From a paper:
PI3Kδ is a class I PI3K that is formed by a catalytic subunit (p110δ) and a regulatory subunit (p85). Class I PI3Ks catalyze the intracellular conversion of phosphatidylinositol 4,5-bisphosphate (PIP2)2 to phosphatidylinositol 3,4,5-trisphosphate (PIP3), which functions as a second messenger, recruiting and activating signaling proteins such as Akt. Idelalisib (also known as GS-1101, CAL-101, IC489666, and Zydelig) is a PI3Kδ inhibitor that has recently been approved for the treatment of several hematological malignancies. Idelalisib is a potent and selective inhibitor of the kinase activity of PI3Kδ.
The 2.4 Å crystal structure of the idelalisib-PI3Kδ complex showed the inhibitor binding in the ATP-binding site and revealed the specific and entirely noncovalent interactions between inhibitor and protein. Idelalisib binds in the ATP-binding pocket. The purine group of idelalisib serves as the hinge binder, with hydrogen bonds between the purine N3 and the backbone amide of Val-828 and between N9 and the backbone carbonyl oxygen of Glu-826. The purine N7 forms part of a water-mediated hydrogen bond network that includes N1 of the quinazolinone and the side chain of Asp-911. The ethyl group of the inhibitor binds in a hydrophobic pocket formed by Ile-910, Met-900, and Met-752. In the apo enzyme, Met-752 and Trp-760 are packed against each other, but in the presence of idelalisib these two residues lie ∼6.5 Å apart, opening a hydrophobic pocket (the specificity pocket) in which the fluoro-quinazolinone of the inhibitor binds. The phenyl moiety of idelalisib packs against the side chains of Asp-832, Thr-833, and Asn-836. The electron density for idelalisib shows that there is no covalent bond between the inhibitor and the protein. The kinase domain and, in particular the ATP-binding site, is well defined by the electron density, but the Ras-binding and C2 domains have higher temperature factors and are more mobile, as are the residues that link the ABD and the Ras-binding domain. Overall, these observations support the idea that engagement of the specificity pocket upon kinase binding contributes to the selectivity profile of idelalisib.
Author numbering: 109 to 173, 187 to 230, 235 to 291, 316 to 335, 339 to 398, 416 to 445, 452 to 479, 482 to 494, ...
The structure:
Amino acid sequence: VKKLINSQISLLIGKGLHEFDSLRDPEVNDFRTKMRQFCEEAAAHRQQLGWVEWLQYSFPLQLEPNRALLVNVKFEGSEESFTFQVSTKDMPLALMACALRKKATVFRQQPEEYALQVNGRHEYLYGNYPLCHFQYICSCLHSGLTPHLTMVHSSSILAMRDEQSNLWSLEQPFSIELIEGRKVNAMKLVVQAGLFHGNEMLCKTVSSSEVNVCSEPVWKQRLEFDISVCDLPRMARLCFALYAVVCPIAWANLMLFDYKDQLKTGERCLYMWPSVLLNPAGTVRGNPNTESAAALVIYLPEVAPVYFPALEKILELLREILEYEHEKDLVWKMRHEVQEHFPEALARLLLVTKWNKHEDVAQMLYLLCSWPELPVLSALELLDFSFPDCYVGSFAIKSLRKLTDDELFQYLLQLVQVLKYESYLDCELTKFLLGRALANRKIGHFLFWHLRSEMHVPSVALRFGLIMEAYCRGSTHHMKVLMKQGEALSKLKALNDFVKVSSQKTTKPQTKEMMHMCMRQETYMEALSHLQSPLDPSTLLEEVCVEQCTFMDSKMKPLWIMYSSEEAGSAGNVGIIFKNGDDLRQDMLTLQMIQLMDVLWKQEGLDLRMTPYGCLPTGDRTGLIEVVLHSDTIANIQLNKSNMAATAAFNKDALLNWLKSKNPGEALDRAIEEFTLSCAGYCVATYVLGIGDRHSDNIMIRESGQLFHIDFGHFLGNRVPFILTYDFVHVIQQGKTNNSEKFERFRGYCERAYTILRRHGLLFLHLFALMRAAGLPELSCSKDIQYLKDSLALGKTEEEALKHFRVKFNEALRE
Ligand SMILES: CC[C@H](Nc1ncnc2nc[nH]c12)c1nc2cccc(F)c2c(=O)n1-c1ccccc1
């Protein structure tokens, strides 16, 4: 009934729906009701999409950011295949008319009625783009492999669709009364309060009296702030630090206006969070661990039922050098000049805006509502917490709406982290994310896992749980596809626990055949088979190949799980790596950032042949990593074993002999080149990102020659030199001792890659800035972000920045 759906939702999101109701919170109840209706409405929009439109929804196109190729095409019901010779400039439709024509001239006698599906993948070829513009067609073109497509009729596509159906007056100073407190430590106690607007103070901080530490203390003391009530901005938050003195203890935050714009009065009790002192960016909701949390009771005086004013009320109420408070000055009362001729300097203007005086806010807000929509880049900036105003927030979302799904996919990790800055449940960002997720099934997929992966974190468990419930309201079908994934994940965790225990008392071979017998149980085989990969929903994991599964007998004992699809061929031969105990958040950001570099590089005609493999936290220190097959570790290669084709007279030849043995004849030149581009790319990626501890065990190489890094762990120096491994350098130089020709080719690739990224330095700064919200220990300060600015060197000219890169590069061929 409606009871099955709720029950599955509770199971899927890892928090029982009954818990939301137990809260008796009308903000929560109104979110669940408003957002439910919102998502149910998208669902009904979706179930009457035209078949091409539904293809777009469910299998969005994977495009790259003259020549002839061999193609193989069949139909759904058939087993019979045709192999054609088409161009690369040919549209998909051209391909489809060929297929249909030979179907006639084989079965005896309209392209528009079909789409092309990659065999064994939820991925399709359609639209007026030449074949080479397709990522699948491209991967094939570089691996020598032949594309395998299936002609799928609009009437079967329609089947899939249906299958998935379902006030200014108050001029007295702001003051609170600090009543009591409720938990203990070790000395005297102090409560520091601060009115904050984002990260800036609306006035001086105000402390309290000192009382003896034990208790359950009592102040009943009146804290009054240097700020009038009528000047409290909408998004103003009051922040408390509780600590000790002759020693940090707890913090807690509260909005002065509720989620209904009403100014807060009366007494409220604050269940604090443990520290290490004021913490303005911390969540504005209480600690859910009410049992053992210090509690802070305060009283907000009832200054009359005063609402924050409607906007209609609010609206009625040398300089280019800069592109000091003798500089703000001229930005602010030349504000109109900034709207006229510098509409992109909005951020700067909002920053010199004093937010502690209401009639200033109104004049900014008056300019804001007439402000021309801004570029995505600028928009990404405005989402930062340093622009806490809810109207700036809406402007930002509004300027963000022109995000393509690819861009949105690319930035989604950040946007999701920014949810932790939000002051209320119901907000524009969330509505924006659910709207986009419901419009694109891949976005939906990853929005879900980013939220799901943090349900063990109580700061966000409620917000994130609510958001997943709403989404689940929007696609009952995808919810079940997603449960399917989580039943797989649940199994791998129990499997991994077994292997960990087993391997502490048993040889590896015997634990492996033990792992296998466990996988062979009915329960496992069913749960682990026939799902979409959480790493990429267009990858289908069909039959788990048990004999090819194993584990690494290192540390966390990660699992190696292989799959096959008797209908995808070699494209269905795919693996996933499950790891439990390590924190995979660091690696996901790094590999996301490397993916972006790769895109930026490729849009300026530079392909450094990167391997940005999937990496996905799915839970508390739990996740999946994408298996890159036909690759081996440098360390393994460098072992220089006997009886191997790669066996070498000098250790430095090992890497190259291995390459020769995998790439005989004139195949060899291609692999050196791939090695060269990919090494260039990774050297630069790790330098900019400040990723040290790079060694032969966390660098791998593909039989094609491509090199790629793994297990990044940290980034941002937590100052890393550029590095150059002589062993890589001597693959690049083709085995030859000196080879400036081939060494400077590579120097060029490094420089070109470096300068290209430099040109997009603002994008990386904006993205990393928003990631501060994620709570990665490597990404906290301003000196973390300063690290990126120096590795990209944006405080300098392209000419002299290149000169600084050359010295570090040259210092790096030290070895
Ligand atoms: C750490 C190196 C390596 N990591 C990776 N191997 C393949 N694709 C990857 N994608 C990300 N990390 C990728 C690895 N990771 C594993 C993880 C779990 C279970 C395992 F058996 C392995 C394993 O055997 N290797 C391995 C080692 C030496 C050669 C070949 C593969």
